[PDB]
Amino acid sequence: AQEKQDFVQHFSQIVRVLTEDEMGHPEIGDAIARLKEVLEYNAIGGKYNRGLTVVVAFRELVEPRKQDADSLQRAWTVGWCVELLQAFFLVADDIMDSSLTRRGQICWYQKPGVGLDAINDANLLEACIYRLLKLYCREQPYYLNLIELFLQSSYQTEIGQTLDLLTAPQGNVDLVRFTEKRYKSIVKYKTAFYSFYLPIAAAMYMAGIDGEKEHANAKKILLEMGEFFQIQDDYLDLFGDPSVTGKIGTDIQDNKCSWLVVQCLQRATPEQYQILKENYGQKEAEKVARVKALYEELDLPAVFLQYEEDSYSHIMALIEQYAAPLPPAVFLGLARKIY
């Protein structure tokens, strides 16, 4: 896009401000050096889809007369705050899941000499958000709105992550917990709210669009798009092409409440339920092959393609009905890239 350029470049000033700006407090140098390393390792390396969304939406939503360099700089900073929310979640999630890599890189907590100290580094990444907001936006009228937005997004992501941990406890294989309401509930709180609501809502407040109806309306579209994003992600984990996706999938081995397995449990005969009690969550490849096979027997990819078409119409209907007074392009830009 026309913006990715400026977005990554501005990370350097984000880092300058967060480290240079306690330079008149030398006794904390050594911890501020470490915060620089946490930031650099964890905030950089993604695609920045969520950060950039804030910027794109800011550009589509704020009257061009009010888009000076200072404004823009604030929008780039809020974008980065979304990225940092992200980095915080991911560093913590990787520790909890005992992950090895992320973005095909070694997980921060696995780096020699980091280990569980990453719990504190993860907290710091979260703290940094509110530092940047204060530094860049304290005089703006949407300041407190943004602060509350970021805290509510965290709470919701956390409540979502609880549901996820209660549903899929590693070692307590119980496919009984994997219902569709549960599934949709986890996605909503854990993924959709911060991934699809947070960034558009942030741009909105920056634009002065702060009414509860406007936000209720954007939220309806965006949680629905988040649910599709994640279902598509579950589907693609197994049936995607790794070269295209950049991802080699392991949902089955990791015991996930994937959409695929919810669907499968709704469509299994008892023999199949047991075939799935037998192979769900084994590293061994033939056990994994066996589950995939079961998924294909029951035409789950045809189910997915059907779901993908229905949901596309549904989102477009939602847009026609709830976008206004926002430009529909704000939503459709995102629909086009996810679909």
Q: Which residues are catalytically annotated?
A: 47, 88, 93, 97, 102, 164, 190, 229, 233-234
Q: Indicate whether 16 belongs to the interface with a second copy (CB under 8 A).
A: no
The interface region with a second copy, picked from 158-166, 246-254, 278-286, 320-328 by CB under 8 A, is: 158-166
Angle at the Cα of 198 from the Cα atoms of 313 and 204, rounded to 5 degrees = 85
Q: Residues 65, 181, 213, 336: which binds a second copy (CB under 8 A)?
A: 181
Q: How far is CA 223 from the centre of its chain?
A: 12
Q: Indicate whether 272 belongs to the interface with a second copy (CB under 8 A).
A: no
Minimum CB separation of residue 223 from a second copy in Å reads: 13
Whether 292 has a binding-site annotation, put simply, is no
CB atoms within 10 A of CB 195: 24
Per DSSP, the residues of 192-258 read IIIIIIHHHHHHHHHTT---HHHHHHHHHHHHHHHHHHHHHHHHHHHHS-HHHHT----TTTTT---
Contacts of a second copy in 20-59 (CB under 8 A): 27-28, 30-32, 34-35
Count CA atoms within 13 Å of residue 248 on its CB side.
Answer: 2
For residue 15, give both structure tokens: 């880092």
Long-range CB contact pairs, 296-299, < 8 A, 24+: 297/272, 298/263, 298/264, 298/267, 298/268, 298/272
Nearest residue (CB) to Mg ion, 22 versus 117? 117
Q: Indicate whether 231 belongs to the interface with a second copy (CB under 8 A).
A: no
Q: Indicate whether 95 belongs to the interface with a second copy (CB under 8 A).
A: yes
The interface region with a second copy, picked from 74-82, 130-138, 194-202, 268-276 by CB under 8 A, is: 130-138
Instruction: Decide which of Mg ion, a second copy, none touches 120; Cβ closer than 5 to 8 Å per partner kind.
Output: a second copy
Per-residue contact string for residues 189-228; x = within reach of a second copy by CB under 8 A: x---------------------------------------
Instruction: Decide which of Mg ion, a second copy, none touches 306; Cβ closer than 5 to 8 Å per partner kind.
Output: none
Whether 103 has a binding-site annotation, put simply, is yes
Q: At 22, give phi and psi (nearest 5°).
A: -120, 40
Buried b (16+ CB within 10 A) or exposed e, 210-248: eeeebbebbbebbbbbbbbbbbbbbbbbbbbeeeeeeee
- Give the interface with a second copy as residue ranges (CB under 8 A): 27-28, 30-32, 34-35, 92, 95-96, 98, 113, 116-117, 119-124, 127, 130-131, 134, 143-144, 147-148, 151, 154-155, 158-163, 165-166, 169, 181-182, 184-185, 189
